[PDB]
Amino acid sequence: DLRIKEIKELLPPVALLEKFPATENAANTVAHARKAIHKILKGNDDRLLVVIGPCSIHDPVAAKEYATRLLALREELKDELEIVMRVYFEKPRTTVGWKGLINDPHMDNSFQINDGLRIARKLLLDINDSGLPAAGEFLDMITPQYLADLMSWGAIGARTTESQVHRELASGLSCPVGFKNGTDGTIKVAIDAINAAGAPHCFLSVTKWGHSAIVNTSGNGDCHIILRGGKEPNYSAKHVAEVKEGLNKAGLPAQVMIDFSHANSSKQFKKQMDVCADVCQQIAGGEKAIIGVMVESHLVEGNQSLEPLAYGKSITDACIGWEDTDALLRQLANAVKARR
Amino acid sequence: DLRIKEIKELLPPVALLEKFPATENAANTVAHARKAIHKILKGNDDRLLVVIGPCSIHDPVAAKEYATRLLALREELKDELEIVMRVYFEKPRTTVGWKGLINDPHMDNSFQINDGLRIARKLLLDINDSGLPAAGEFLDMITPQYLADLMSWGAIGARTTESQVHRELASGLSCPVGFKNGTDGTIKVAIDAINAAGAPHCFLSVTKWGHSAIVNTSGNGDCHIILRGEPNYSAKHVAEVKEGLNKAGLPAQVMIDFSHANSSKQFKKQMDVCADVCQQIAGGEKAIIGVMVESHLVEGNQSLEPLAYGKSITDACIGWEDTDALLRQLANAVKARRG
Amino acid sequence: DLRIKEIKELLPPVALLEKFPATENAANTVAHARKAIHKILKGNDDRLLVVIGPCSIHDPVAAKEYATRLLALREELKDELEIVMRVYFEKPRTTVGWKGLINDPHMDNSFQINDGLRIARKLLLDINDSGLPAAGEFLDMITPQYLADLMSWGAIGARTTESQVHRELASGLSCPVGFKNGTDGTIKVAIDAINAAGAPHCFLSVTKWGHSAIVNTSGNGDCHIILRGGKEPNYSAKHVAEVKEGLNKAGLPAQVMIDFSHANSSKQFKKQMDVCADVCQQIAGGEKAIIGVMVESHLVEGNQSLESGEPLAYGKSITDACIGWEDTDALLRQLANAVKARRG
Amino acid sequence: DLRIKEIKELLPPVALLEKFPATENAANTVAHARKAIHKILKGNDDRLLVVIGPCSIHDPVAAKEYATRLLALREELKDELEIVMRVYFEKPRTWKGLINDPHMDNSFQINDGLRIARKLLLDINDSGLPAAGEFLDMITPQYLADLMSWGAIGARTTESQVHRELASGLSCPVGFKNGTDGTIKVAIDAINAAGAPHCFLSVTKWGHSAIVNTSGNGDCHIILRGGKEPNYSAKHVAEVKEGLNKAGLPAQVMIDFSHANSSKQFKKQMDVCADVCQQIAGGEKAIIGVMVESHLVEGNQSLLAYGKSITDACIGWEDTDALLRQLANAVKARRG
Ligand SMILES: O=C(O)/C(C[C@@H](O)[C@H](O)[C@H](O)COP(=O)(O)O)=N/O
Ligand SMILES: [Pr+3]
Ligand SMILES: [Pr+3]
Ligand SMILES: [Pr+3]
Ligand SMILES: [Pr+3]
Ligand SMILES: [Pr+3]
Ligand SMILES: [Pr+3]
């Protein structure tokens, strides 16, 4: 009505799925990575899930370069690390800001969202087709139909871990999903989310044809917590123990994924290397509860603001550079061989 | 989609708008109320916005009797109060329970949402058509298209004040919106939410036709905080909130939720909160621009065999006699603050 | 799309069905009438189906006045006639012209089709709720979803009996369907259509949600020919016998509905009474194959034109000329008398 | 809905458009061919439109082989003939085609048939061979009409208001067949109705019903296909020309060599060719086009052999080369 200025046409998921179908290789990649993460979340596999990549995708060419480098390390460190690339097309803002490649691919408030979906699905498809699994945050309620079939692992953001519609979304997603602890370090909201997402739900959603409908979900038991800090970090064994106690109390597996960035690094990118030190000591000491980690990495460390932009630098959160990334990864895989 | 078991047809919004179109009376009710709340939020009216009514509606018949009683008080106290009926269809919770009138109108877990939507719109239509404005809660992104044209005020869920998708929704709502503070009593997320909601946004949404589309909003400047709690209705807390709002550059105004934490989960304590808030107002507090009270015909609650008439099946409410006294307490207070 | 000037929002059928649901009595009218026509078609009832009423609906008020009068005769004559009102909202044109109430309800080329659908369904609902069944021509491929649940009988026009998409539509309609012979008098196109409509089909159509979809139909066994004349009228006994033998050779029951109007009256509205006199003699003489008739009838006889700009007369056709109410009463009593004589 | 058994999902047009967008080559083929046919119909080109190809496409491989052979004769005889391939994906009966049942088994895999048909049309146009189609359905056109340079309304639907409405909004020129009996009145009526603007309900590229308004289509003409007796002779053209002139329309005609004009015999198409060539070479400027049922192999088959029709019987490639050259020489003599 009065506060809706304009309404514009939107391609339906089925149109993106027809233009950019999954290649056989892409399908195989997704299936294998999901099965491997299920094996890790059920304890049958001792390796570590590493979700690593840019805070946000804004340049498909650099992403293709990053993916080529990360894919090499995935094949080399595969005995200790299940590497999944961060391919974030959606970004939650504390108040306002650039919301990601889908919402605004030209970074200029043009909102060419149909091109955003075309660009994002094609990049996601090419990455998977090369053999590299991909991960994203599921923030929007309507975009998942265009992308989810190419997602090997998903995240629910700290500012939406408490959101019913997002817990419902998780309960129907074909991939494992991680829920961030609240902005204040509150762990309870995430356990409740894991519990909710493991149950069936009945709710309103949008179909592959772009039409609203009633949807019934089965429940997703491949769900786990992601520690991302609060006013202070929470990546330490002590914190891990507290969390593992809350998980056992709730009838849930005492498994944790540790995010080296955001509140766990105080928004200082280089601090991810020190969080890595601490977590690697926990693994080498015997912590089987750390089943995964998450790292904000890019070709060039730091971040830049939004006219032409520097190559390989994040336009959102500051990331560690590739050299630090190659090193961080070997450290993690060294700690995994020690724990084994 | 291997964790999606079934997909069933949903009536498009235009089907419910064609079946239950707004009468001229209902449309006038909504327009007048929205204007009145804007005037209060702009500091151009010294009257108190009162959103009052059941925790959740589970019986349209009892809701219409409530609306008749409340309408009478709305006319008697209009010089001091802008009375809006709380027409909430669900109690958001994580534990198991009735999913509300839209999700489960027959209260049996049959999830007859088409039926629920029909019942909800018809009730909203009837209440507005009688002259009583209605206030709702926005818990998802798809049902507002069926109902918001009959809402004069809305509240975003407490568990979603932080969510970008709910802030995007508020940016394009035609009615004023209240954002609840944090479970710790902090006001930062609600300030972030008011800022975000006041900005223009572009996002994906379902249209009146039942199809996803791209929508651009203007931003909603009629948003405010709701203080809902340990309790935070006290004058110290109100001063603290006013300070945070002034520093953030927002108007130092607040709506106070008398129920839940602010009442330590004891329905009768809403009368204690009322006594305190009335004290703050009569002494001169102009920041308190609204209140929220959980009220029904019959006080208390019951668990969902027949049910007691007019008694909440969700959270406990004050009953009509207390409601009549509370509203007179608030009105006498508005007279005092004035002169 | 260089020749598509404008595209506009259309209410989906679920909106009209939700706004105007069938009442209990309306649904009863439709179900009873369809069953009664099925019975006549199977040879288990000796009554005459009579489809009668305006060439086109353009005024809901006159249409309801007409319906009330017709309903009273429907009740009075129901041992002899199964009376169904023509409630035609769609008109096929020889070239160009007003396409009917749905396409253009204000009759001024404003094409307010959403209001037309609303006006049309509400009228169909009021007429059925009163107890009077309704008949229409199925011309448009999208409008049936808005109306077909309130239709007891349908016609596929002379210009579309040959059309594959209309034969497909008929194969999935829940009501009996009449196929008019071709505009040049050809019977075979009508027999082919009956056989086509009796078979299952798979085709593209629009659902009640206004979306395209793939539909599978079961086939419609309640189809028959309508005799509407060609270069010359084809209502006489010589013509009915050729149609009877033509139908049997194709393996179909020798049954016919005769349209008294259009080419069988040589487009001279009062000649419907001359056809009536001949068809009555045939029926009362023992002709069982004549299972129905069709008559263009209004409150006031004649027609009038919209081209004038003059205010329209009440109760008078803006399309084909029609007989007025007095002749209509006399004609229905003639038919009932003949059906009684056929029996005794 | 007692007589409706099942309702199955259908890809919206936007899905097939996104999967199979028009190459710039395809788009240019379409545009140039449409503008050239306009020029023939406005009488500013003495060239002859030739719509030629199989009665029906059942094998995309054989259809692409035909397209290749025909493109050669197209560029060779371009100064006399505007050659457009007949790519007929919907068939009228009383098997509805590759779109309705691509695998030919009553499996009715229409989403696959739509995918196959749009791909074949896109490939043929990308090559430089414009395509011609029959418009039988009101929904299929939104998935294929962008790749069509000319279209026909079948004889069984010339009289139908809903097909005239569709014709009035098509971006391509349209031919209307005379009805089964040699009479042109329904076809003259159809040309007049399709020339006028119309408002009607249709399905958009998004798969939703909506109200559309059309401008009218002035690029419509008659197609003589005969009836009980053939109507391609000079006497017949003259009668049709007088009828057209009385109705107020350009006195122009396309002549279908097959069907009744051939009395259901594929070799008689060569005889009609003889006759029409004699008429054109004698100075008949009113014959602006012809239609021939041609395949790589001659004849037909039922319920397969390669490059042979499973519908109407067609002429083989040798006869096809000969006929195209005959028409070209005839148009050369008309010009000279
Ligand atoms: O209603 C019927 O049963 C019909 C349709 C008939 O009413 C037609 O619509 C006009 O006679 C055409 O009028 P024009 O020839 O002026 O376009 N039978 O043919
Ligand atoms: Pr980040
Ligand atoms: Pr674009
Ligand atoms: Pr409550
Ligand atoms: Pr129901
Ligand atoms: Pr008529
Ligand atoms: Pr209107």
Ligand SMILES: [Pr+3]
């Ligand atoms: Pr053929």
Ligand SMILES: [Pr+3]
């Ligand atoms: Pr397939």
